[PDB]
Amino acid sequence: NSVSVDLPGEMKVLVSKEKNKDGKYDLIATVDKLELKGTSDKNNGSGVLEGVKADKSKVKLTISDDLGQTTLEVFKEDGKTLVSKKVTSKDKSSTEEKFNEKGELSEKKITRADKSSTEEKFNEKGELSEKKITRADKSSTEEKFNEKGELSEKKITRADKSSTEEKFNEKGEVSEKIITRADGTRLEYTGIKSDGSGKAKEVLKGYVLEGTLTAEKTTLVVKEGTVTLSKNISKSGEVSVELNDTDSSAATKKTAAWNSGTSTLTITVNSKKTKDLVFTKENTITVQQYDSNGTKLEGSAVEITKLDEIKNALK
- Structural domain containing residue 92: 78-215
CATH number at 256 reads: 3.90.930.1
Are 250 and 208 members of one domain? no
Amino acid at 75: F
Dihedrals phi, psi of 80, to nearest 5 degrees? -125, -40
DSSP string, the chain: -EEEEE-SSS-EEEEEEEE-TTS-EEEEEEETTEEEEEEES-SSS-EEEEEE-TTS-EEEEEE-TTSSEEEEEEE-TTS-SEEEEEEEETTS-EEEEEE-TT--EEEEEEE-TTS-EEEEEE-TTS-EEEEEEE-SSS-EEEEEE-TTS-EEEEEEE-TTS-EEEEEE-SSS-EEEEEEE-TTS-EEEEES--TTS-EEEEEEETTEEEEEEE-SS-EEEEEEETTEEEEEEE-TT--EEEEEEE----TTT-EEEEEETTTTEEEEEETTEEEEEEEE-TTS-EEEEEB-SSSSSB-S--EE--SHHHHHHHT-
> Structure resolution in Å?
2.4
Are 202 and 223 members of one domain? no
Are 165 and 187 members of one domain? yes
Are 164 and 95 members of one domain? yes
Number of domains in the chain: 3
Are 221 and 285 members of one domain? yes
Are 92 and 202 members of one domain? yes
Question: C-alpha 315: how far from its chain's center?
Answer: 40
Are 224 and 314 members of one domain? yes
Are 303 and 180 members of one domain? no
CB atoms within 10 A of CB 86: 18
Are 83 and 52 members of one domain? no
Are 210 and 226 members of one domain? no
Picking from 163, 188, 215, the residue at the C-terminal end of a domain is 215
Picking from 215, 243, 262, the residue at the C-terminal end of a domain is 215
Beta bridge partners of residue 294, listed in sequence order: none
Alpha carbons 315 and 308: distance in angstroms, whole number: 11
CATH number at 55 reads: 2.40.128.160
User: Method of determination?
Assistant: X-ray
Are 126 and 242 members of one domain? no
Residues with Cβ < 8 Å from 74, sequence gap 6 or more?
Answer: 57, 58, 59, 82, 83, 84, 85
CB-CB contact of 206 with 306 (8 Å): yes
Picking from 215, 240, 264, the residue at the C-terminal end of a domain is 215
Beta bridge partners of residue 4, listed in sequence order: 14
Alpha carbons 25 and 200: distance in angstroms, whole number: 69
Are 158 and 264 members of one domain? no
